[PDB]
Paper text:
The ncAA l-enduracididine is an early intermediate in guanitoxin biosynthesis and is produced by GntC, a unique pyridoxal-5′-phosphate (PLP)-dependent enzyme. GntC catalyzes a cyclodehydration from a stereoselectively γ-hydroxylated l-arginine precursor via a reaction that functionally and mechanistically diverges from previously established actinobacterial cyclic arginine ncAA pathways. GntC initially facilitates the reversible deprotonations of the α- and β-positions of its substrate before catalyzing an irreversible diastereoselective dehydration and subsequent intramolecular cyclization. Consistent with many type I/II PLP-dependent enzymes, the GntC active site is found at the homodimer interface.
GntC crystallized as a dimer of homodimers and adopted a largely α-helical structural fold. PLP was bound to K219 in each monomer as an internal aldimine; this was consistent with sequence alignment results that suggested this lysine was responsible for anchoring the cofactor in the active site. PLP-bound and PLP-1 GntC structures were highly similar (0.31 Å root-mean-square deviation (RMSD) for backbone atom overlap) with the major structural difference being an additional N-terminal ordered helix that helps form the active site in the PLP-1-bound complex. When comparing PLP-bound and PLP-1 internal and external aldimine substrates, there was a 30° downward rotation of the pyridine ring, orienting the amino acid substrate toward a new ordered N-terminal helix that was not present in the first structure. The comparison of holo- and substrate-bound GntC structures and activity assays on site-specific mutants further identified amino acid residues that contribute to the overall catalytic mechanism.
Residue numbers in the entry:
A (entry chain A): 18 to 194, 200 to 369
B (entry chain B): 17 to 194, 198 to 369
Amino acid sequence: VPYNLGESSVDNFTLGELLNLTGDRDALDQLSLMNNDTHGSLRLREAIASLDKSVSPDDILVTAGTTEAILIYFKVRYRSGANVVVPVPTFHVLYETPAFLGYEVRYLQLRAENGFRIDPQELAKLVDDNTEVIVLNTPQNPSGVVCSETEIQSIIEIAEKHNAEILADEHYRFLPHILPSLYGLSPKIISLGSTGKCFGCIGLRIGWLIGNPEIIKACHFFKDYTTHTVCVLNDYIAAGVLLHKGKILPRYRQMIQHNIQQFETFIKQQRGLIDWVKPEAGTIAFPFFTDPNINSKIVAKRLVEDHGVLLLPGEAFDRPSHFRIALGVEPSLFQYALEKLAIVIET
Amino acid sequence: RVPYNLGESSVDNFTLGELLNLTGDRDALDQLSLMNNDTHGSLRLREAIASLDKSVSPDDILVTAGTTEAILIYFKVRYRSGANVVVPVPTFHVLYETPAFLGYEVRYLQLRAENGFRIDPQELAKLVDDNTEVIVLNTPQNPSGVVCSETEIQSIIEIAEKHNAEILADEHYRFLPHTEILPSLYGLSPKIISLGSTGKCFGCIGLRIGWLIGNPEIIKACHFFKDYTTHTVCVLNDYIAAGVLLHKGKILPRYRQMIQHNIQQFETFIKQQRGLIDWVKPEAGTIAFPFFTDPNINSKIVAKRLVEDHGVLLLPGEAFDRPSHFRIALGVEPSLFQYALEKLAIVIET
Ligand SMILES: [Mg+2]
Ligand SMILES: [Mg+2]
Ligand SMILES: [Mg+2]
């Protein structure tokens, strides 16, 4: 569809556009197509580590996207009778991969009436001594909510009291409306990051895991049975992306804030029919119809067939009144999408 | 990290620039969008893969990040409680260790140098029962280089079709026969799932491009579960691997030439060793699995002393539970191969 607002990545570069910003074009031809460093290249791991003082280049395992990292981590920490706590709505892999691996998945239902925020007392009611992982996706996909320092501190306290690790999916830390990594805040925190969603190069398939030496050694071992290594080419391009983030992220931040303002104007024009928890960071928002009778699936279907505008209906997150909309698109397409959405609402 | 590594199963790898000079794909890379690739792999790559055999259509192919991912996805989708897999060993460790991780009962079919590392049909039927879901068929074999004959293939198909077990045909090394490439086994029976890759044969193992070839239902099931391993492969690797296949005639003859020169060099080396060294002569692929005919020397300590004193790495046969054997790469420069043989003779003498 020409007006696709249903993705969680920003508008992607071409390879040539990206290399004109990173300067990495001439170095690519000398790269060897032998197997990459199995932890990821030092250049990429040092570029990742430079984002946070708490992170050293040896704490990092580069994976083929965070999807692979999620799989390897949950496999390593699996044991019979273990459970994972997943706040939902979130990226589906974060609860489906543990389920595939045999985990008992305990869902923490986040809701727009509570600002999609984690209540520590409701999380402590889900964590026991068999809880091995608490998933913490911040900034959140689809809400865009950033966990406050006190919510994090309460989660750290629940996790350290039950010896549960915290899987902090920090995919969207690069686009505040960068956010510091949670990796240093507690020994139980394992951090996930990626260039994909924030830098206009989701197709590079570069993610990383940050953890203590034993979880890194265990994840590195099992990666031999998923993809072995990531390509030196994607590795090298992703590293230059991070080292030149100042040529990429501010432009996307500017696009997102224009689209946030455009959606707030759209909220005023809809006069209470549309609301949202205003996002704090990332590439997406999760607005909702304030009418419990309208189903976003039927609005979205008419919008994509009659106008070619794609919004992700909230049923994909079991929130039928909501829909996710991409903020990292050109503001003209964003505004065009809202104007067609207003037409579907009016009729 | 040792400069004279003969312990790998890939051929000498290109730099990206060396490969692009052969495929002509350099100028096209800049226009590629970094959005998500086609989740089956690009049509350009799947058409290039499919063009290798009449039995293969572009819709039968799922591109993965190496065959390691395809192996994980395939065994996951086909797993059920109480299922077993039959794996001829020695073979690539992932082919039996990944099923073990997924809960399969792994039944090993010991391949043997006294039998030419060939599959015995009567010994395979004694391992396949009604609970066998997969029979692994690595041809050409890693580490032996043995190609399964036409009669061995039909006998395996008959054991598989009588117990309704699938055949996972790892055809990684079909591009380097010692015909231009070996024919795919995919069309030979509806139970055969084919795995292929450009990595080991084309000098670009680092691209991480593999593929699975199967019926529409296994493709759909594998495509679904790929969303939980890597989602998609990069459009850049996809594009380069397609050009590798479309220009295989500009790439493979050099490696075939290197391998046959090294096969001749090792045959001269066997004669110089006067019965101390033997092998099942490889028929295809990038590797050989020679052995010492002396039951007293341990190949692991020979390899240990060879790398420390000469910087030459051979893979000791203990890695395949064949202590008298060692694996040696044939897809290296013949000058480096000869250097390795001349230093291996020095370690042997003392
Ligand atoms: Mg640092
Ligand atoms: Mg516990
Ligand atoms: Mg064909």
